[PDB]
Amino acid sequence: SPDTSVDNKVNFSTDVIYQIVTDRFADGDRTNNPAGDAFSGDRSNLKLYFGGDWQGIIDKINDGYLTGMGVTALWISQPVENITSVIKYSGVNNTSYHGYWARDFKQTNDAFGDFADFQNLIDTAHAHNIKVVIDFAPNHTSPADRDNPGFAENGALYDNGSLLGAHSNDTAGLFHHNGGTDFSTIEDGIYKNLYDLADINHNNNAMDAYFKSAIDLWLGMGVDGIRFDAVKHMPFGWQKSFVSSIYGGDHPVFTFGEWYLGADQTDGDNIKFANESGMNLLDFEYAQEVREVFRDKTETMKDLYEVLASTESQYDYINNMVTFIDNHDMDRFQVAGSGTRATEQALALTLTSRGVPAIYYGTEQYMTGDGDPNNRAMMTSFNTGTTAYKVIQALAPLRKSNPAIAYGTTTERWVNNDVLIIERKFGSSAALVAINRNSSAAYPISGLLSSLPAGTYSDVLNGLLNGNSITVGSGGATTNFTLAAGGTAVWQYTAPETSPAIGNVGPTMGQPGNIVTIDGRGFGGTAGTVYFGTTVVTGSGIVSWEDTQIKAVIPKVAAGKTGVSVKTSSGTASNTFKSFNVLTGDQVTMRFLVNQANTNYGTNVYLVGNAAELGSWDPNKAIGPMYNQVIAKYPSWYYDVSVPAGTKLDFKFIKKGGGTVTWEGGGNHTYTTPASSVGTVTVDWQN
């Protein structure tokens, strides 16, 4: 019922995610272990199955390891049936232990368990107030060789046990046949194969229907979240259409993808994805920077806040960024032979910072290992006594109890090369966090100011990371203190809120009729009003209303970005959740093709149209730069776009380059979209 409930599938910023590589966590059932060349009994080959399964996860929930840590969500390997063949990559036998080589998206990987096992995991987690997130990888099936049907399992796709097709002799046209990508461009990485993985053709409506059917199965079993694999390698438009159908369905859930960024790197396409796909993202800008600051010491605390400020400017849904200090695709945070304070401080920052914190299994056991697959070693121990375990145990529950932590703004109160003091603020609640990364020097903190009410505040960590108590004056001035070497402390104030405050709205995108979840404080007990822009939602439009959460039906309002606000029963107004994307209606994915659109170097073709999904005639929101190498060749251009179903579209193409915009001549192109199917529309550039 409240915002913090395990029942809240759609919003995760009050949660702490624990990321499990299922095969490498705990073998709770040896009877489902693979055997022979596919299994590593002595764990000498990290590319074979070790035997970790869902029973193992269930066991660590029941025996208190996970629950005692204070984690409230598990993010697990893709649960679906994978290939069972052993593949000799680079002189070494490899398996599907990682779950990414699907063969049937409607069946389980029997190494992990059967469907009853999976239901048991869902129910056991939910009973313990833990949400479950699954990897889902609709980009591809499994390895295939163009010139050898006998390689691996030839990327074969089954549908509840019956053959849909394989990569060789792909008679139903389920796969792309453009070779492998060189990752040179996003287009190249989308419509060519990811390494040798048979690449799903989502412009084939058989595949659109198949994957919508598949995900509904898993959501019907009670899955609370989806982590999409390889979002950079599928069309933006197909994924936007895909998640909109989830949001319009019976089980809206939290979704996020992995779009990798290196250290010191920003990517505009990454930002557009997170802001406009309807899907959120792992926060690699955060992750890489925190590693630079604490692990490698290659950036200062001043650099750190600069990144926090810039992400704030870049991303529209800041409370949805999934933060972390490492994961399955990075070198382990802990460097072997190094101290543990770096880990403990990085964890404390992540747990108290904006977004959705995710912790990679074994981080709290200081597990080491550089590169794949060394970063995916078996869980080394279940010792509940490590400092890192205790850090998580102390801080993770604050995400549930202190709305400033879960939802609040972020403010810099103090900075030095080695010292950062951050303040979170939401309504009357606040949290103040101080970190000194220097293990050899303490720092006097003088003249520090805070939004904390006057009083004495003890460290939530109780000095575990050498923190201290503080005294706050009636003007907000913090009495001078010394922040100890390696110091980390958290001071907090939680108040009863009298004025309505919106902390998050999920999903961030929806067509009229979708049910959205509005989380926060001070909504009151009796139903008030919800607003999309100035459009009122009342009575039957209100699904439910309590003080920390409202569920509302998206009204028939004009499509486009708008602000969501509320008004209590006594007429008190709230803040606004900005940039909610109202869709025109149910979506389909449409491939747009334009022919004979020649351009000069530096000029690209874009798509614009009257629908909001087509940028509403705004050349600055034109869709593109369009693609012109793989699916179709220059001077033809193409793009796959999420557009309203059963709807007449008016559109034109434009050429943009060097600050000048040239529009197509003649009248608008017109096209009425399919009612439910993906489709293709092909037109000629009008001179």
Which residues are near Ca ion by CB under 5 A? 27, 29, 32-33, 51, 53, 139, 199, 233
Alpha-carbon dihedral sign for residues 64, 70, 75, 80: positive
Min dist CB 470 to Ca ion, Å, is: 49
Min dist CB 317 to Ca ion, Å, is: 25
Q: Which is nearer to Ca ion, 51 or 403 (CB)?
A: 51
Q: Which is nearer to Ca ion, 53 or 135 (CB)?
A: 53
Min dist CB 532 to Ca ion, Å, is: 35
DSSP 3-state assignment of 59?
Answer: helix
Q: Which is nearer to Ca ion, 199 or 344 (CB)?
A: 199
Q: Shortest Cβ contact with Ca ion: which residue?
A: 53
Min dist CB 197 to Ca ion, Å, is: 8
Min dist CB 219 to Ca ion, Å, is: 23
Pair 108, 118: CB distance under 8 Å? yes
Give per-residue burial for 65-101: e unless 16+ CB within 10 Å, then b.
bbbebbbbbbbbbbbbbbbbbbbeeeeeebbbbbbbb
Burial of 675 (0-12, 13-18, 19+ CB in 10 A): exposed
DSSP 3-state assignment of 591?
Answer: strand
Q: Which is nearer to Ca ion, 45 or 599 (CB)?
A: 45
* Element of type H or E holding 207: helix 205-220
Alpha-carbon dihedral sign for residues 371, 373, 376, 381: negative
Min dist CB 28 to Ca ion, Å, is: 7
Q: Round to whole Å and give the CA distance between 172 and 206.
A: 9
21: closest CA among 54, 45, 43?
Answer: 54
Helix extents (H) in 425-532? none
Pair 255, 242: CB distance under 8 Å? no
Q: Which is nearer to Ca ion, 114 or 372 (CB)?
A: 114
Tell me the Cα Rg of the chain: 26
Min dist CB 193 to Ca ion, Å, is: 8
Token pair 């009612």 is found at: 675
CA distances from residue 661 to 169, 394, 593, 594, 605 in whole angstroms, order as listed = 45, 56, 19, 17, 10
Q: Which is nearer to Ca ion, 27 or 292 (CB)?
A: 27
Q: Which is nearer to Ca ion, 235 or 624 (CB)?
A: 235
Min dist CB 87 to Ca ion, Å, is: 20
DSSP labels, 377-430:
-------TTSHHHHHHHHHTTHHHH-HHHHH-EEEEEEE-SSEEEEEEEETTEE
552: closest CA among 530, 568, 536?
Answer: 530
Pair 514, 542: CB distance under 8 Å? no
Catalytic site residue from 153, 196, 229, 519: 229
Min dist CB 199 to Ca ion, Å, is: 4
Min dist CB 279 to Ca ion, Å, is: 16
Output phi, psi for 211, to 5 deg.
-75, -30
Q: Which is nearer to Ca ion, 189 or 487 (CB)?
A: 189
Pair 358, 75: CB distance under 8 Å? yes
Catalytic site residue from 188, 258, 289, 613: 258
Q: Round to whole Å and give the CA distance between 357 and 34.
A: 33
229 is catalytic: yes
Q: Which is nearer to Ca ion, 237 or 357 (CB)?
A: 237
Residue 674 identity (one-letter amino acid): P
Residue 214 identity (one-letter amino acid): A
Burial of 563 (0-12, 13-18, 19+ CB in 10 A): middle
Residue 566 identity (one-letter amino acid): V
Q: Round to whole Å and give the CA distance between 143 and 156.
A: 9
Q: Which is nearer to Ca ion, 141 or 488 (CB)?
A: 141
Instruction: Give the active site residues.
Output: 229, 258
